[PDB]
Amino acid sequence: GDERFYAEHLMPTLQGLLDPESAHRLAVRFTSLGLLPRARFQDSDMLEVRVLGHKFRNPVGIAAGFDKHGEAVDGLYKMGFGFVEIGSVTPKPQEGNPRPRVFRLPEDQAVINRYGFNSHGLSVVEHRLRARQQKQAKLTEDGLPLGVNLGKNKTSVDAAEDYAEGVRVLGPLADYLVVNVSSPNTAGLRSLQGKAELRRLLTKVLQERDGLRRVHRPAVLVKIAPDLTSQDKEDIASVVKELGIDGLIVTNTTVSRPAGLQGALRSETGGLSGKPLRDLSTQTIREMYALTQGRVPIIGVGGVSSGQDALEKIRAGASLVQLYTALTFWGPPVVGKVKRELEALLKEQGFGGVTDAIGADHRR
Ligand SMILES: Cc1cc2nc3c(=O)[nH]c(=O)nc-3n(C[C@H](O)[C@H](O)[C@H](O)COP(=O)(O)O)c2cc1C
Ligand SMILES: COc1cccc(-c2ccc(NC(=O)c3ccsc3C(=O)O)c(F)c2)c1
Ligand SMILES: O=C(O)c1cc(=O)[nH]c(=O)[nH]1
């Protein structure tokens, strides 16, 4: 493939022929089949990162949402991602919201989605991952970890138990689990970010995680929204420290609509991703890093489309970064682009490697 070809011809043509959701489905299909452009870039030692009890070949991963049901994990590693996160997965299967539920904002290099946790359910995903469990074991040992993002059912009467079930069912198959309490498309989900409820919720999740056999015991991270108040962030940092949460994913999509959006569909209900979210996410990473005294690993997500975007989040405190929306606009070549640009910037700024740059802004 070619970065310019995909950005100017292939992707534009695809988006002109298929609606957003159909384009996504096709994307998952092609990826699962390995129909991807040549992954030129060769990961250098400079990009290697050790965190969350694992080695990561490179710090660029695919964010949750692209492979909700764990159907294209291997194809995603082939695309060049240093780690893959599937999900969110709900206990029981559910359809999500009616279509259309995803919209492109071309003029803003953004997307708005309100899928509503469409999920094949824990059982289906469980067997899908078991079919390649040993293959993943080798991938992980080779520096390509797998993360599993857990969600809750729309009609659930016990949010905590939904997450507990996810820990028990998919925890044994993941390197890290994500307690996603930041989806803007699930009524009352974000309220789980409150201190009182959060502590109770995470205490239960951690107990279930600790109850798994050693080799099947994943790290547990909490994914937060970019729309939290200063009080919310202080509370989350406090609870994370109190319970020993392994890490944070910052951030999910935003329900805010920054001044300046041009897309005709800017007022659609849902979470906004892409460039308009980038700096709000970076600043959230910066604050959480400071609140946790840089002792809690952070996976930075939100508007990453270049090496500069990645490095800004790393310097702000992220040990790893993820992207999704950039892929929807530029295609597979964007992964290699980000890694190549990141490597060059690290050298240009005097960093021996990614590890040396983590939280660098806080030390100046
Ligand atoms: C279409 C779509 C679906 C998503 N689904 C999920 C999900 O199921 N779980 C989750 O934790 N985040 C989900 N996200 C959020 C992304 O993981 C990420 O936090 C956010 O989009 C910011 O990254 P980006 O600007 O690179 O897309 C989704 C995002 C998009 C655009
Ligand atoms: C042969 O070339 C390839 C190979 C492998 C994957 C893709 C591809 C195609 C479309 C999307 N796009 C989305 O998956 C998407 C998600 C939510 S919206 C939206 C979109 O197009 O607007 C992609 F990420 C990757 C193209
Ligand atoms: O499934 C969705 O609608 C969804 C979940 C989530 O966590 N984030 C997002 O942007 N959409």
Side-chain angles (χ1 to χ4, degrees):
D2 175 280
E3 316 188 322
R4 193 171 302 174
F5 181 66
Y6 275 71
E8 293 179 54
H9 301 71
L10 198 156
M11 297 305 279
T13 299
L14 179 57
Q15 297 186 301
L17 299 179
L18 302 175
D19 58 288
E21 181 155 356
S22 296
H24 171 65
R25 298 176 62 69
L26 184 61
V28 174
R29 287 275 190 60
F30 270 62
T31 301
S32 68
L33 295 175
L35 304 180
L36 315 167
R38 191 136 301 175
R40 36 165 285 298
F41 188 74
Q42 292 183 296
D43 292 347
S44 64
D45 294 358
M46 289 188 79
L47 298 182
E48 171 174 342
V49 176
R50 157 156 279 297
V51 66
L52 296 176
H54 291 283
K55 174 176 63 178
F56 294 71
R57 293 253 284 283
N58 70 69
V60 182
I62 177 69
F66 179 74
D67 190 5
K68 283 171 173 287
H69 327 295
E71 303 171 291
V73 180
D74 294 300
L76 287 165
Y77 286 125
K78 181 176 181 179
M79 211 176 279
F81 289 109
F83 64 110
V84 172
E85 180 174 315
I86 64 168
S88 300
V89 188
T90 58
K92 298 294 181 295
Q94 61 175 44
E95 292 189 301
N97 292 315
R99 302 184 181 187
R101 50 192 182 177
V102 60
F103 313 85
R104 301 171 178 131
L105 279 64
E107 297 87 356
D108 307 300
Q109 287 178 48
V111 168
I112 289 180
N113 87 84
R114 52 164 178 272
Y115 270 96
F117 279 166
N118 50 307
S119 172
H120 288 180
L122 290 174
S123 180
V124 170
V125 177
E126 176 207 315
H127 293 104
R128 192 165 285 149
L129 293 187
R130 282 184 171 182
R132 60 180 296 285
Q133 181 164 28
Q134 294 313 306
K135 177 192 295 184
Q136 182 60 60
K138 292 191 177 62
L139 284 166
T140 294
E141 174 67 4
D142 195 41
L144 299 171
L146 173 67
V148 173
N149 190 304
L150 304 178
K152 65 176 190 62
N153 284 115
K154 181 177 182 176
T155 64
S156 181
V157 186
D158 192 332
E161 183 60 16
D162 269 31
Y163 292 104
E165 297 179 308
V167 171
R168 291 194 290 269
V169 180
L170 297 183
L173 293 146
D175 286 309
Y176 73 82
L177 288 177
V178 183
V179 178
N180 179 27
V181 297
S182 53
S183 170
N185 308 306
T186 292
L189 180 62
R190 291 174 294 173
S191 71
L192 298 178
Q193 273 166 150
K195 195 168 190 178
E197 295 185 359
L198 187 61
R199 184 186 295 112
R200 185 179 307 91
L201 168 66
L202 299 180
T203 292
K204 180 168 183 172
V205 167
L206 292 175
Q207 180 180 302
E208 287 319 283
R209 182 284 296 283
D210 290 341
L212 300 177
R213 289 163 68 89
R214 225 291 182 176
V215 302
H216 295 284
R217 197 175 298 154
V220 170
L221 295 78
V222 178
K223 185 167 181 178
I224 66 179
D227 311 311
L228 301 172
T229 63
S230 294
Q231 178 72 77
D232 294 326
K233 298 171 201 172
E234 290 180 6
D235 293 345
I236 291 172
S238 175
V239 175
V240 161
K241 173 182 181 179
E242 185 195 321
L243 306 181
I245 286 295
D246 304 302
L248 292 166
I249 295 192
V250 192
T251 67
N252 206 310
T253 52
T254 182
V255 293
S256 74
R257 292 295 183 271
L261 292 178
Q262 297 305 306
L265 308 177
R266 70 188 186 187
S267 289
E268 285 289 347
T269 286
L272 177 72
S273 62
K275 197 190 295 294
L277 169 67
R278 189 184 58 201
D279 287 14
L280 175 60
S281 294
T282 297
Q283 291 284 37
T284 303
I285 290 167
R286 202 180 298 290
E287 181 61 24
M288 297 312 298
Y289 186 80
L291 290 174
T292 54
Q293 307 189 71
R295 302 172 182 176
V296 176
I298 291 168
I299 295 183
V301 197
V304 172
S305 187
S306 70
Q308 175 176 299
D309 302 334
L311 188 55
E312 292 197 334
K313 281 180 164 56
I314 289 165
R315 288 179 61 86
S319 291
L320 301 169
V321 300
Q322 301 177 313
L323 62 80
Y324 182 172
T325 300
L327 181 66
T328 78
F329 283 105
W330 316 127
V334 74
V335 185
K337 188 196 75 168
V338 172
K339 294 189 297 181
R340 182 182 69 249
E341 298 178 329
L342 175 57
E343 186 181 310
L345 289 170
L346 285 167
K347 295 178 177 298
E348 181 177 359
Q349 287 170 38
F351 293 111
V354 172
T355 306
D356 296 314
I358 300 173
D361 290 340
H362 298 263
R363 302 189 288 281
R364 65 197 315 297

